[PDB]
Write a protein that binds this DNA or RNA. Structure first.
Lengths: 189, 62, 72, 101, 144, 67, 143, 138
RNA sequence: ACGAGACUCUGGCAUGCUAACUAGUUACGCGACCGGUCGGCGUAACUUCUUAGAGGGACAAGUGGCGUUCAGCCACCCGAGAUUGAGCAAUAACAGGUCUGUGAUGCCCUUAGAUGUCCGGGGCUGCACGCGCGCUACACUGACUGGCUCAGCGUGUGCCUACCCUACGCCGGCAGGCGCGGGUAACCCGUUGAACCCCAUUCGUGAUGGGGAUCGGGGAUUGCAAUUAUUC
């Protein structure tokens, strides 16, 4: 087979970015089944870029030190809630995933300029990689806080967080804090 | 606030207080007759595309 | 903080469960325990009873992660 | 009996290997069934210690290291030939022994 | 083309072994089941009330895998990290009394026999019974 | 981080200035001739010297070299 | 099926009101002797339905629990498992769980207080007598 | 009949002996798809799902795995299997079949034919971890 | 010229070579399964995984571009490796520390009302707060029944060196016991059956079962003595 997890279709992926697809793309022969191939992607600049999105996003689950390096839990926790998402939504655990991340990544940030600038900042464009990495962390942080002292468990916060991100709702922590940072930047333009 | 794409043609340099911005020249697709200078935040590449929220704004050059 | 949940059969536990609980599209022990505010022990007992009846479909089983889908 | 072993224990690899090659060549010269140089796993003793005499300054630990090596060679021969081939002007600093089965 | 002793899920294979043994009911239990702590890392009392059957089945499986597992091998199979609270924990061997009682309970019941190298091994009749169990449980869902 | 020390550069210059005829353009032959006609007490040093010798041969073909 | 009679949310063991919202074998931990592995042992030797809920527990089962826990001689459980092994005053090895006397047994320092031992003096000052360093640490409990 | 090509991952290793037989594969004297974690079963199963079962229906491969660490024990089984097939085909049958299988796997995954260069770095003194040092007093 | 680099040690490659019956493929009742998994055996091929020796191998070497077309840098083919990690580490100095290592010590204090091994009898295990190097913790990211399949470095039974790591049978919850005990070594520990997890009762959203951090009581092995239970 060539499908993700043997159930997720590989052929109905959409461009959906025209020319930003080069950094969010799962359509090649390297798109493997189980997102677990050790940590050889963080060894050189943009050798992470050729990695498929599913792999990096399941990698970004292990935070807080208590669950550091528990990639088995991460792949199980992604397989669960993937077998859920499409189910509750209906599309393709993939297409929904790319749409959710694209909707959860900021596009404009604020940076200080000059040798001694200490009063004002300036608006700057955000590169694909930076926003995607940040968005994945936001999604993971939202899942963690929906699983922290809350009635919801792991491998389930991710599903509804991704559904909200695809929907564009303010329920998800990701896009709501994206909007907060965007408002800060807009006041800082 | 329209959003448009422009192709990177020459990565001019790296600036910023501690250094976080890449100043780069981008040529628009739909015109190809006008190019601008933008400081993109985050790891950027050569020949890729960048999403700008404002086309009338340019960062400091040199 | 504190969450007082009933730990015995009562009027609310059995009612709106034969249809309205599988009437949703997403059913899990977390989902049922949240949309009914009952302990997961009796919820899992009812789920096992219904599975022995064979009207809901299991996707995953665990002591902390069980997945159900409508089969009626 | 035809069950004779010889044991060469040392610290340097060059002198021990030259001695082993000399012994194997000499035992090959006479028509002997000799087992080749068996290399026992070298053992290195690690000693991380204080550098300063009195505790003062930075915690710099001297990792003194001694590696020792052992070779065992079996051969089926008259023991008189074993004695006559042992005294072949062996290298200083190598300990050579003869073991019976 | 024959049947493999380990072609089944070892978890479900050992569960089938426990079910077969408790259907047989031959293996006895000692009088006390509440005195022994049963694990230097344990925090409470075991919640099975039948852990002797599972222990015997698992130990017979282990003796099938390899022999010589005498008094000194079993205690370190389940022995492990022992929480000392604030102190960094350390490895502690399993309780020797209950392990020795298990060794005496498995002995003398026509499944475990003495071997030249010490410890004990599995009598071939028990191996044939386990192979029959494995074949049946394979035909249950793996051969249909 | 692949700048050549003056030992390698000077040895390559001397070898090229004395033994132009023997050496060629393939590193695996320059290393052999260099180890033949020189006392190089290390394999790594010989590899570095031969690599810079091959680079110097690629330099001379396009024109005379200053050094 | 389920029991509609006798249903009480309180299991009175020592004229006390314990929380019934907790499941069995864990809610009874509140007693000064019953709890942790002690409760597990007494309910395991009680031979009752440990898989049932606390609400479905009947009066007869709590009565059986009281009978088994009153007599450590009911099932020949050795004395060392108990906390009052090798008792003071008189050699005592049975079990009696009751309020108003258990704290006096806890007040076993007064006997050694009367012997003015080093342990007695250390107990007088409220310090950790097991050799714990109290040089300047220990700021909790003094405001 | 036997190539014994082995395969490495961390300090752990796996040896896949390949012979002419029924085509069935055994690992640790056991069938293939019942490994207890059941999480990375397809990770080691990749060769079959990539090259097809027919390429795996003419060689009997017995794989033995030894080395500390359970995740280190896995990730060498599939590399050993691929290397065993490559060596067996090159030694016995012809070049073209092994060429196609190696080309397909490499275009899929490069790691299936070459070992991992990564290994655990030593720990230098003055700190709790490998690179990390003790907390300074300021 | 010194320092840097080179260099020494270490690892990423050796189906090329010298090779062992301590570790081991491939090898037929013996121990068995309706042609197949099973550390109980022995010679055979003589080394692939196993150990360590000679070597060899990587050189910004081969392409694309940038570069005062230089020194170099950035990507790709190939390759095990396209920056493995340490050791050593220069001028000249600090009134830095060490006279509590010195039987290396100078000069004052010494020269018995001593400034030592002798009872160890005697103490930093004494407390009204803060700075200074970590672990448990905050859980439905996991405590939790066990089903489990697997390590690396190495000290290890004594020309005054008594102190050694661990299997058979039994006892006991625990410290241990007795007969030979396996250890001149990869033969013995041990196919080091260690940490998480693939599951098995509770918790199903917590002050509790985790936090046992503070007070009761039971035992052993080197201890003339373990009180201020230091030790399990």
């Amino acid at each position: 087979d060539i499908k993700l997890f043997g159930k997720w279709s590989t052929d109905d992926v959409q461009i959906n970015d025209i020319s930003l697809q080069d950094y969010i793309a799962v359509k090649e022969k390297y798109a493997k089944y189980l997102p677990h191939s050790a940590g050889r992607y963080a060894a050189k600049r943009f050798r992470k870029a050729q990695c498929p999105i599913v792999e990096r996003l399941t990698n970004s689950m292990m935070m807080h030190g208590r669950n550091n390096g528990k990639k088995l839990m991460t792949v199980r926790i992604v397989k669960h809630a993937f077998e859920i998402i499409h189910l509750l939504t209906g599309e393709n655990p993939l297409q929904v995933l790319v749409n959710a991340i694209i909707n959860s990544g900021p596009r404009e940030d604020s940076t200080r300029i000059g040798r001694a600038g200490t009063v004002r900042r300036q608006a700057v464009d955000v590169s694909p990689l930076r926003r995607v990495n940040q968005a994945i962390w936001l999604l993971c942080t939202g899942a963690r806080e929906a699983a922290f002292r809350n009635i919801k468990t792991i491998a389930e916060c991710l599903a509804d967080e991704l559904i909200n991100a695809a929907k564009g709702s303010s329920n998800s922590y990701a896009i709501k804090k994206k909007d907060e940072l965007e408002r800060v930047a807009k006041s800082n333009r | 606030q329209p959003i448009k794409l422009a192709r990177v043609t020459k990565v001019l340099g790296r600036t910023g207080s501690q250094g976080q911005c890449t100043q780069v020249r981008v040529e628009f697709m739909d015109d190809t007759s006008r190019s601008i200078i933008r400081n993109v935040k985050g790891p950027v590449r050569e020949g890729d595309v960048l999403t700008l929220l404002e086309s009338e704004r340019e960062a400091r050059r040199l | 903080d504190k969450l007082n949940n009933l730990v015995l059969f009562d009027k609310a536990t059995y009612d709106k469960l034969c249809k309205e609980v599988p009437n949703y599209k997403l059913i899990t022990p977390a989902v049922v325990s949240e949309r009914l505010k009952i302990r997961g022990s009796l919820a899992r007992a009812a789920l096992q009873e219904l599975l022995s009846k064979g009207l809901i479909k299991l996707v995953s089983k665990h002591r902390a992660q069980v997945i159900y889908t409508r089969n009626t | 009996i035809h069950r004779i072993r010889i044991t060469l224990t040392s610290r340097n690899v060059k002198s021990l290997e030259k001695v082993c090659a000399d012994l194997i060549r000499g035992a090959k010269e006479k028509n002997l069934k000799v087992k080749g140089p068996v290399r026992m796993p070298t053992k290195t003793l690690r000693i991380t210690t204080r550098k300063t005499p009195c505790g003062e300054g930075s915690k710099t630990w001297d990792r003194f290291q001694m590696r020792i090596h052992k070779r065992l060679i079996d051969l089926h021969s008259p023991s008189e030939i074993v004695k006559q081939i042992t005294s072949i002007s062996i290298e200083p600093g190598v300990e050579v022994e003869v073991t019976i089965a | 083309p024959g049947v493999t002793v380990k072609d089944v899920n070892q978890q479900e294979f050992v569960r089938a072994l426990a079910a077969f043994l408790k259907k047989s009911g031959k293996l006895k239990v000692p009088e006390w089941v509440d005195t022994v702590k049963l694990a230097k890392h344990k925090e409470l009392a075991p919640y099975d009330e039948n852990w002797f059957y599972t222990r015997a089945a698992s130990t017979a499986r282990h003796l099938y895998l390899r022999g010589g597992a005498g008094v000194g091998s079993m205690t370190k199979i389940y022995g492990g990290r022992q929480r000392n609270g604030v102190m960094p924990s350390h490895f502690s061997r399993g309780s020797k009394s209950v392990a020795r009682r298990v060794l005496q309970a498995l002995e003398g019941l026509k499944m475990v026999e003495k071997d030249q190298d010490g410890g004990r091994k599995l009598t071939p009749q028990g191996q044939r019974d386990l192979d029959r169990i494995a074949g049946q449980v394979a035909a249950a869902n793996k051969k249909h | 981080g692949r700048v050549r020390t003056k030992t390698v550069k000077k040895a390559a210059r001397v070898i090229i200035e004395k033994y132009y005829t023997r050496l060629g353009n393939d590193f695996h032959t320059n290393k052999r001739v260099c180890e033949e006609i020189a006392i190089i007490p290390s394999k790594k040093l010989r590899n570095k010297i031969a690599g810079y010798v091959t680079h110097l041969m690629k330099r001379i073909q396009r024109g005379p070299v200053r050094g | 099926l389920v029991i509609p009679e006798k249903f009480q949310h309180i299991l009175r063991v020592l004229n006390t009101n314990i929380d019934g919202r907790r499941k069995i074998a864990f809610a009874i931990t509140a007693i000064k002797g019953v709890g942790r592995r002690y409760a597990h042992v007494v309910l395991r030797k009680a031979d009752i339905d440990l898989t049932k809920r606390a609400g479905e527990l009947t009066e007869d089962e709590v009565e059986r629990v009281i009978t088994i826990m009153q007599n450590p001689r009911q099932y020949k459980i050795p004395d060392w498992f108990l906390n009052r092994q090798k008792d003071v005053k008189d050699g005592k090895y049975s079990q009696v769980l009751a309020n108003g006397l258990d704290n006096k047994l806890r007040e076993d320092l007064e006997r050694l207080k009367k012997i003015r031992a080093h342990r007695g003096l250390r107990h007088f000052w409220g310090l950790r007598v097991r050799g714990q360093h109290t040089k300047t640490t220990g700021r909790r409990g003094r405001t | 009949q036997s190539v014994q090509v082995f395969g490495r991952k961390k300090t752990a290793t796996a040896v896949a002996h390949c012979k002419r037989g029924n085509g069935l594969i055994k690992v640790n004297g056991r069938p293939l798809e019942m490994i207890e974690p059941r999480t990375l079963q397809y990770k080691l199963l990749e060769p079959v799902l990539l090259l097809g079962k027919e390429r795996f229906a003419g060689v009997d491969i017995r794989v033995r795995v030894k080395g500390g660490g359970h995740v280190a024990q896995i990730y060498a089984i599939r590399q050993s299997i691929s290397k065993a097939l490559v060596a067996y085909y090159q030694k016995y049958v012809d070049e073209a079949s092994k060429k196609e299988i190696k080309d397909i796997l490499i275009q899929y995954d490069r790691t299936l034919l070459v070992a991992d260069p990564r290994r655990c770095e030593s720990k230098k003194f003055g700190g709790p971890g490998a690179r990390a040092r003790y907390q300074k007093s300021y």
